[PDB]
PDB file of C-alpha atoms in Angstrom:
ATOM      1  CA  UNK A  11     211.997 150.683  31.775  1.00  0.00           C
ATOM      2  CA  UNK A  12     209.956 152.719  29.176  1.00  0.00           C
ATOM      3  CA  UNK A  13     206.737 152.008  27.243  1.00  0.00           C
ATOM      4  CA  UNK A  14     205.559 153.767  24.094  1.00  0.00           C
ATOM      5  CA  UNK A  15     202.528 156.047  24.387  1.00  0.00           C
ATOM      6  CA  UNK A  16     202.115 157.951  21.143  1.00  0.00           C
ATOM      7  CA  UNK A  17     203.976 159.787  18.412  1.00  0.00           C
ATOM      8  CA  UNK A  18     203.517 163.335  17.212  1.00  0.00           C
ATOM      9  CA  UNK A  19     205.149 165.010  14.219  1.00  0.00           C
ATOM     10  CA  UNK A  20     206.961 168.338  14.788  1.00  0.00           C
ATOM     11  CA  UNK A  21     208.902 170.858  12.750  1.00  0.00           C
ATOM     12  CA  UNK A  22     212.185 171.727  14.418  1.00  0.00           C
ATOM     13  CA  UNK A  23     214.626 174.636  14.122  1.00  0.00           C
ATOM     14  CA  UNK A  24     217.582 175.562  16.302  1.00  0.00           C
ATOM     15  CA  UNK A  25     217.613 178.933  18.090  1.00  0.00           C
ATOM     16  CA  UNK A  26     219.469 180.495  15.117  1.00  0.00           C
ATOM     17  CA  UNK A  27     216.775 179.274  12.679  1.00  0.00           C
ATOM     18  CA  UNK A  28     218.762 176.425  11.172  1.00  0.00           C
ATOM     19  CA  UNK A  29     216.744 173.376  10.202  1.00  0.00           C
ATOM     20  CA  UNK A  30     217.897 169.753   9.808  1.00  0.00           C
ATOM     21  CA  UNK A  31     218.466 167.986   6.468  1.00  0.00           C
ATOM     22  CA  UNK A  32     219.589 164.420   5.898  1.00  0.00           C
ATOM     23  CA  UNK A  33     222.942 164.903   4.189  1.00  0.00           C
ATOM     24  CA  UNK A  34     223.513 161.188   3.834  1.00  0.00           C
ATOM     25  CA  UNK A  35     221.671 158.229   5.175  1.00  0.00           C
ATOM     26  CA  UNK A  36     223.568 158.286   8.499  1.00  0.00           C
ATOM     27  CA  UNK A  37     224.206 162.020   9.023  1.00  0.00           C
ATOM     28  CA  UNK A  38     221.974 164.990   9.745  1.00  0.00           C
ATOM     29  CA  UNK A  39     223.313 168.470   9.104  1.00  0.00           C
ATOM     30  CA  UNK A  40     221.932 171.827  10.111  1.00  0.00           C
ATOM     31  CA  UNK A  41     221.564 174.740   7.736  1.00  0.00           C
ATOM     32  CA  UNK A  42     219.589 177.843   6.853  1.00  0.00           C
ATOM     33  CA  UNK A  43     217.325 176.527   4.106  1.00  0.00           C
ATOM     34  CA  UNK A  44     216.725 179.639   1.983  1.00  0.00           C
ATOM     35  CA  UNK A  45     214.577 179.961  -1.160  1.00  0.00           C
ATOM     36  CA  UNK A  46     213.807 176.806  -3.161  1.00  0.00           C
ATOM     37  CA  UNK A  47     216.073 173.764  -3.199  1.00  0.00           C
ATOM     38  CA  UNK A  48     216.000 170.040  -3.815  1.00  0.00           C
ATOM     39  CA  UNK A  49     216.932 169.688  -0.060  1.00  0.00           C
ATOM     40  CA  UNK A  50     214.007 168.535   2.023  1.00  0.00           C
ATOM     41  CA  UNK A  51     213.625 169.789   5.614  1.00  0.00           C
ATOM     42  CA  UNK A  52     213.572 167.070   8.240  1.00  0.00           C
ATOM     43  CA  UNK A  53     210.595 166.780  10.504  1.00  0.00           C
ATOM     44  CA  UNK A  54     210.644 164.721  13.690  1.00  0.00           C
ATOM     45  CA  UNK A  55     208.237 161.935  14.664  1.00  0.00           C
ATOM     46  CA  UNK A  56     208.630 162.354  18.406  1.00  0.00           C
ATOM     47  CA  UNK A  57     207.591 159.148  20.224  1.00  0.00           C
ATOM     48  CA  UNK A  58     206.573 159.841  23.783  1.00  0.00           C
ATOM     49  CA  UNK A  59     207.299 157.124  26.371  1.00  0.00           C
ATOM     50  CA  UNK A  60     206.128 156.506  29.928  1.00  0.00           C
ATOM     51  CA  UNK A  61     208.490 155.093  32.582  1.00  0.00           C
ATOM     52  CA  UNK A  62     207.139 151.784  33.932  1.00  0.00           C
ATOM     53  CA  UNK A  63     221.245 162.934  36.574  1.00  0.00           C
ATOM     54  CA  UNK A  64     219.627 166.090  35.057  1.00  0.00           C
ATOM     55  CA  UNK A  65     216.969 163.982  33.311  1.00  0.00           C
ATOM     56  CA  UNK A  66     213.372 165.372  32.953  1.00  0.00           C
ATOM     57  CA  UNK A  67     210.362 163.371  32.480  1.00  0.00           C
ATOM     58  CA  UNK A  68     209.272 163.425  28.974  1.00  0.00           C
ATOM     59  CA  UNK A  69     211.320 160.540  27.691  1.00  0.00           C
ATOM     60  CA  UNK A  70     211.116 160.434  23.905  1.00  0.00           C
ATOM     61  CA  UNK A  71     212.554 158.749  20.825  1.00  0.00           C
ATOM     62  CA  UNK A  72     213.334 160.960  17.835  1.00  0.00           C
ATOM     63  CA  UNK A  73     212.278 159.547  14.480  1.00  0.00           C
ATOM     64  CA  UNK A  74     213.472 161.194  11.247  1.00  0.00           C
ATOM     65  CA  UNK A  75     210.049 161.463   9.630  1.00  0.00           C
ATOM     66  CA  UNK A  76     209.777 159.679   6.287  1.00  0.00           C
ATOM     67  CA  UNK A  77     213.230 158.125   6.401  1.00  0.00           C
ATOM     68  CA  UNK A  78     212.592 155.165   8.779  1.00  0.00           C
ATOM     69  CA  UNK A  79     215.476 156.221  11.034  1.00  0.00           C
ATOM     70  CA  UNK A  80     215.740 157.010  14.764  1.00  0.00           C
ATOM     71  CA  UNK A  81     218.417 159.044  16.499  1.00  0.00           C
ATOM     72  CA  UNK A  82     220.647 157.210  18.941  1.00  0.00           C
ATOM     73  CA  UNK A  83     223.599 157.942  21.202  1.00  0.00           C
ATOM     74  CA  UNK A  84     226.442 155.446  21.225  1.00  0.00           C
ATOM     75  CA  UNK A  85     230.136 155.317  21.920  1.00  0.00           C
ATOM     76  CA  UNK A  86     232.324 155.577  18.830  1.00  0.00           C
ATOM     77  CA  UNK A  87     235.909 154.883  19.630  1.00  0.00           C
ATOM     78  CA  UNK A  88     236.081 156.473  23.030  1.00  0.00           C
ATOM     79  CA  UNK A  89     233.676 159.373  22.340  1.00  0.00           C
ATOM     80  CA  UNK A  90     229.931 159.747  22.778  1.00  0.00           C
ATOM     81  CA  UNK A  91     228.363 160.182  19.360  1.00  0.00           C
ATOM     82  CA  UNK A  92     224.975 160.867  17.834  1.00  0.00           C
ATOM     83  CA  UNK A  93     224.042 158.514  15.076  1.00  0.00           C
ATOM     84  CA  UNK A  94     221.093 157.656  12.938  1.00  0.00           C
ATOM     85  CA  UNK A  95     219.907 154.063  12.831  1.00  0.00           C
ATOM     86  CA  UNK A  96     217.442 152.172  10.706  1.00  0.00           C
ATOM     87  CA  UNK A  97     215.042 151.080  13.432  1.00  0.00           C
ATOM     88  CA  UNK A  98     211.361 150.308  13.667  1.00  0.00           C
ATOM     89  CA  UNK A  99     209.068 151.917  16.219  1.00  0.00           C
ATOM     90  CA  UNK A 100     209.873 150.455  19.634  1.00  0.00           C
ATOM     91  CA  UNK A 101     207.085 149.541  21.954  1.00  0.00           C
ATOM     92  CA  UNK A 102     209.399 148.670  24.841  1.00  0.00           C
ATOM     93  CA  UNK A 103     212.694 150.161  25.927  1.00  0.00           C
ATOM     94  CA  UNK A 104     213.749 147.605  28.451  1.00  0.00           C
ATOM     95  CA  UNK A 105     217.529 147.368  28.213  1.00  0.00           C
ATOM     96  CA  UNK A 106     220.600 149.619  28.575  1.00  0.00           C
ATOM     97  CA  UNK A 107     221.200 148.872  24.892  1.00  0.00           C
ATOM     98  CA  UNK A 108     217.791 150.185  23.785  1.00  0.00           C
ATOM     99  CA  UNK A 109     218.144 153.246  26.041  1.00  0.00           C
ATOM    100  CA  UNK A 110     220.430 154.577  23.247  1.00  0.00           C
ATOM    101  CA  UNK A 111     217.211 155.773  21.545  1.00  0.00           C
ATOM    102  CA  UNK A 112     215.797 157.715  24.500  1.00  0.00           C
ATOM    103  CA  UNK A 113     216.222 161.413  25.120  1.00  0.00           C
ATOM    104  CA  UNK A 114     214.667 163.583  27.731  1.00  0.00           C
ATOM    105  CA  UNK A 115     212.732 166.373  26.141  1.00  0.00           C
ATOM    106  CA  UNK A 116     213.368 169.427  28.336  1.00  0.00           C
ATOM    107  CA  UNK A 117     210.919 172.198  27.653  1.00  0.00           C
ATOM    108  CA  UNK A 118     211.207 175.814  28.862  1.00  0.00           C
ATOM    109  CA  UNK A 119     207.470 176.387  28.810  1.00  0.00           C
ATOM    110  CA  UNK A 120     207.584 180.173  29.366  1.00  0.00           C
ATOM    111  CA  UNK A 121     210.035 180.528  26.410  1.00  0.00           C
ATOM    112  CA  UNK A 122     208.694 177.829  24.019  1.00  0.00           C
ATOM    113  CA  UNK A 123     212.165 176.309  23.696  1.00  0.00           C
ATOM    114  CA  UNK A 124     213.439 172.768  24.095  1.00  0.00           C
ATOM    115  CA  UNK A 125     216.661 170.877  24.808  1.00  0.00           C
ATOM    116  CA  UNK A 126     217.187 167.140  24.307  1.00  0.00           C
ATOM    117  CA  UNK A 127     219.341 165.260  26.786  1.00  0.00           C
ATOM    118  CA  UNK A 128     220.539 161.665  26.064  1.00  0.00           C
ATOM    119  CA  UNK A 129     219.238 159.032  28.529  1.00  0.00           C
ATOM    120  CA  UNK A 130     222.168 156.761  27.622  1.00  0.00           C
ATOM    121  CA  UNK A 131     224.696 159.602  28.127  1.00  0.00           C
ATOM    122  CA  UNK A 132     223.290 161.828  30.866  1.00  0.00           C
ATOM    123  CA  UNK A 133     224.821 165.383  30.607  1.00  0.00           C
ATOM    124  CA  UNK A 134     224.960 165.123  26.822  1.00  0.00           C
ATOM    125  CA  UNK A 135     222.624 167.159  24.635  1.00  0.00           C
ATOM    126  CA  UNK A 136     221.783 167.233  20.971  1.00  0.00           C
ATOM    127  CA  UNK A 137     223.577 170.128  19.397  1.00  0.00           C
ATOM    128  CA  UNK A 138     224.285 171.974  16.196  1.00  0.00           C
ATOM    129  CA  UNK A 139     227.267 173.918  15.100  1.00  0.00           C
ATOM    130  CA  UNK A 140     227.277 177.732  14.965  1.00  0.00           C
ATOM    131  CA  UNK A 141     228.348 177.247  11.365  1.00  0.00           C
ATOM    132  CA  UNK A 142     225.946 175.996   8.729  1.00  0.00           C
ATOM    133  CA  UNK A 143     226.230 172.652   6.895  1.00  0.00           C
ATOM    134  CA  UNK A 144     227.909 170.806   9.761  1.00  0.00           C
ATOM    135  CA  UNK A 145     226.757 167.546  11.434  1.00  0.00           C
ATOM    136  CA  UNK A 146     224.201 167.461  14.220  1.00  0.00           C
ATOM    137  CA  UNK A 147     225.879 165.968  17.272  1.00  0.00           C
ATOM    138  CA  UNK A 148     225.924 165.654  21.048  1.00  0.00           C
ATOM    139  CA  UNK A 149     227.844 167.735  23.589  1.00  0.00           C
ATOM    140  CA  UNK A 150     228.448 167.856  27.313  1.00  0.00           C
ATOM    141  CA  UNK A 151     228.804 171.674  26.980  1.00  0.00           C
ATOM    142  CA  UNK A 152     225.301 172.527  25.691  1.00  0.00           C
ATOM    143  CA  UNK A 153     225.002 176.016  24.141  1.00  0.00           C
ATOM    144  CA  UNK A 154     228.761 176.747  24.640  1.00  0.00           C
ATOM    145  CA  UNK A 155     230.116 177.443  21.095  1.00  0.00           C
ATOM    146  CA  UNK A 156     227.318 175.278  19.774  1.00  0.00           C
ATOM    147  CA  UNK A 157     223.525 175.475  19.851  1.00  0.00           C
ATOM    148  CA  UNK A 158     221.591 172.984  22.017  1.00  0.00           C
ATOM    149  CA  UNK A 159     218.308 174.931  22.136  1.00  0.00           C
ATOM    150  CA  UNK A 160     215.429 174.332  19.691  1.00  0.00           C
ATOM    151  CA  UNK A 161     211.953 175.497  18.860  1.00  0.00           C
ATOM    152  CA  UNK A 162     209.445 172.775  18.007  1.00  0.00           C
ATOM    153  CA  UNK A 163     206.143 173.436  16.258  1.00  0.00           C
ATOM    154  CA  UNK A 164     203.347 170.853  15.977  1.00  0.00           C
TER     155      UNK A 164
END
């Protein structure tokens, strides 16, 4: 279904200038990182795929640069959930199972902004809370009492 083409490292902030930090090995949080801290801003190793809903055609995997993790969407209980998984770089995404790692990168080129829609859970988008120091998650109500819009810089 998808084959790896290349990876590129990006800084990422949400539209309210929160960045990501790895709060614990399986949870990203979003916060305004101000002044100096011990807390280290997350960068993304964005792996671009080629194919061999509302889903637009830059399929990508999102690697948490320097932590050897990739974002995934899976069901937890009965609810779609964003999680972080220890995973190596995947050359082939060729199963429903592996599609958990794929998001469609949706750029608004005019505006320089980006949304990320799950391939495994179409209609679900990576989101942050309006409040700082809360988990990064997924929502089927993007940008409705959450933030699902980002600015990436390479």
